[PDB]
Amino acid sequence: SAIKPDMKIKLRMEGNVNGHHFVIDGDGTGKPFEGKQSMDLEVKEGGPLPFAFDILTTAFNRVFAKYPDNIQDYFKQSFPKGYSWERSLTFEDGGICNARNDITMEGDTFYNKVRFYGTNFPANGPVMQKKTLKWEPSTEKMYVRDGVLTGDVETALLLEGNAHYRCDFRTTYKAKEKGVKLPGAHFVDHCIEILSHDKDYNKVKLYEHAVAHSGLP
């Protein structure tokens, strides 16, 4: 196994939401086999961010997910050469964006080159007004569509005042190494939370727990 039980995470995201440019650095640690990761995020440029930090978090690696023996782990088989993903998020009020991550490994460290582009968010909407509280736990459906590993998520952000703001993600995953065998369809349950933050989310501690299953208990 190229992958150790304890892997470090290095991350730089360059992005633009509704015109606003920003650069965010990440430094964290994770247990790939337990499906757990936590990282410290620091806004390096464009702060304070004039939009809800929460729309970024899922962009801050499915290599951190507990896979049972009876599902093919595409992600952990992708290393050490690594893999990329591209994602389109579609929000109920027209807000759309495209995120990509190119993931590489060097010794005990995953390096992440992340790009995040958002547009069409209404000025009076929960994202530009900063009314989001968190992502609800989600289930990512994994399947193959025209020879590409694809994940669909129908989810929501909890808003101030008991309301939800609906998310549809579609992610395409591609190993750098030709002939990493595609897995069979399956599910990944996700648990993403902001553990701590300063006043304007210039510094954020992020945690994710993910588990792969066939649908049964």
Residue numbers in the entry: 2 to 61, 65 to 221
Task: Give excerpts from the publication.
The system studied was a reversibly switchable fluorescent protein (rsFP) which is a representative of a class of proteins that undergo a reversible photolysis reaction from a highly fluorescent “on” state to a weakly fluorescence “off” state. The specific rsFP used, rsKiiro, is a mutant of Skylan-NS33 specifically developed for ultrafast time-resolved crystallographic studies due to its ability to form crystals that diffract to high resolution (∼1.1 Å for single-crystal cryo-MX), high photoswitching quantum yield (∼18% Trans-to-Cis in the crystal), and high protein expression yields. Structurally, rsKiiro is similar to green fluorescent protein (GFP) with an 11-stranded β-barrel surrounding an α helix. The chromophore of rsKiiro is formed from the Ala-Tyr-Gly tripeptide at residue numbers 62–64 in the α helix.
In this study, we probed the light-induced reverse reaction, from the Trans to Cis chromophore conformation, initiated with 2 ms 405 nm pulses at a range of optical flash energy densities (0.1–6.7 mJ/mm2) after the initial Cis-to-Trans photoconversion had been driven to completion using ∼13 mW/mm2 of 473 nm CW illumination. A total of 435,200 images were obtained across 6 laser energy densities at 405 nm of 0, 0.1, 0.53, 1.78, 6.74, and 14.43 mJ/mm2. From these images, 79,976 single-crystal indexed diffraction patterns were obtained and merged into 6 data sets for each corresponding laser energy density. Data below a value of 0.5 in Fourier shell correlation were discarded, leading to a uniform limit of 1.7 Å being applied to all data sets. The initial examination of the chromophore-omitted maps clearly shows increasing occupancy of the Cis state at higher energy densities. A clear difference in reaction yield can be seen even when comparing the lowest flash energies (0.00 and 0.10 mJ/mm2), where a difference of 3% population transfer is determined from the shift in the minima.
